[PDB]
């Protein structure tokens with residue numbers, strides 16, 4: 001729950017890294 | 023799929039215990055065991071499992087889902103001879119024909135009716151428009167006028183269709199898949215009437231099938247809307263009930279969709295001859311249909327001989343009166359995405375997440391986006407999991423994912439590993455709960471292609487893990503859940519950015 005939120009926010013951070021790359 | 027037995031799937035609101043009794047007579051005569059199951063969401067589980075060669079020998083559902091199953095190669099063409107065909111009504115065979123071939127056995131014709139409590143309401147309303155005033159009066163007595171399932175669009179369709187809504191337009195012998203009919207004034211007038219009942223507290227947006235059934239059968243509400251399968255539980259409840267024509271709206275009949283309960287044979291079944299024997303010579307007989315109908319009523323059965331025996335039942339007469347005012351559902355493969363989109367629209371309007379106009383305006387592009395997205399994401403997740411590969415835009419999108427999505431999983435493996443590990447995905451409920459992670463990806467209000475491709479990439483990472491822990495059948499519901507998050511909440515963004523063509527363009531090089 002906290003775990004699912006932390007995982008979802010990590011995916012968002014990775015996704016922004018990917019967005020910046022491309 | 024095990025040779026030498028039959029596994030049958032049918033929905034949990036139908037007479038599956040009666041069907042098992044027919045199976046016991048088959049077993050008596052043949053030694054072949056017949057297992058009847060009623061999984062949840064069976065109409066979605068079937069195409070998922072059957073596509074990998076698994077699932078039941080025989081699948082029961084209304085005919086509207088069978089065109090898509092057939093198009094995907096999941097159904098055996100059935101081979102009843104002309105003398106067998108003559109035993110069932112022609113219009114029921116018409117509902118189970120796809121691209122010229124018969125792809126299921128018709129069982130019974132279903133339509134919703136108004137069910138009312140004769141003790142609370144001996145003279146039920148003829149019009150929807152009377153229901154607010156009636157509910158106010160009944161509330162002063164500790165009762166309510168009307169409760170029915172607001173979570174499945176099947177039950178609100180009669181009202182939406184009354185003044186002009188339609189699914190797909192039929193002209194020149196076929197449905198125009200580019201002409202969906204919920205974004206028009208009649209559809210909107212009907213859904214507005216329903217949402218206004220909710221706004222004025224005559225109905226609750228959360229009411230689902232079980233809640234409505236319990237209210238009517240405990241005598242708390244004067245009316246419900248349901249099909250013939252429900253009559254058995256009302257019999258048990260001792261409520262004094264009648265079954266009648268649905269109320270009019272703007273003076274026009276409610277137009278319920280007509281479904282033909284149908285039984286298809288899995289293309290992957292090693293038991294097709296046994297399945298044919300069971301269906302033709304055990305189920306589709308007076309004695310077979312009687313056993314099912316005694317458990318949960320079937321409606322107007324497809325078998326002429328038994329339909330004639332039952333036709334005197336006033337409840338069945340009312341079913342057919344409502345059916346004659348409605349339309350036969352299409353069976354085209356777009357129907358699943360259509361229902362996805364209309365379900366979202368009704369729930370969004372009923373809850374106030376959208377206005378009625380916005381909700382119905384979104385439906386057509388939502389269904390197209392869902393169908394296309396689901397295909398891309400499911401193909402990528404499954405090929406990643408299996409290691410083997412099994413329309414131009416979808417081809418390019420999959421080639422993009424093989425590069426970019428595999429690339430995310432390479433570059434971010436350490437994070438992805440500890441992500442899926444902290445989540446500790448052990449079973450089917452854990453996989454369902456991943457939809458919460460997905461929503462969190464967008465919870466700060468930002469949408470972009472990097473986040474979208476990263477979520478899909480993590481879906482592929484999880485799908486590989488699911489296969490390793492013997493939960494490979496959970497890959498398709500994972501894909502569907504990702505698709506749902508994207509289409510339900512990011513439709514506007516996906517449209518602005520030109521959908522999957524924009525995805526391919528963004529990640530080009």
Ligand SMILES: OC[C@H]1O[C@H](O[C@H]2[C@H](O)[C@@H](O)[C@@H](O)O[C@@H]2CO)[C@H](O)[C@@H](O)[C@@H]1O
Pocket residue numbers: 033035065084085086087132174175176177281361
């Ligand atoms: O709500 C969309 C839904 O409508 C129909 O499903 C009916 C079914 O035909 C009935 O036999 C009964 O089980 O209730 C269902 C509604 O909960 C469509 O057949 C189905 O494809 C569609 O999703």
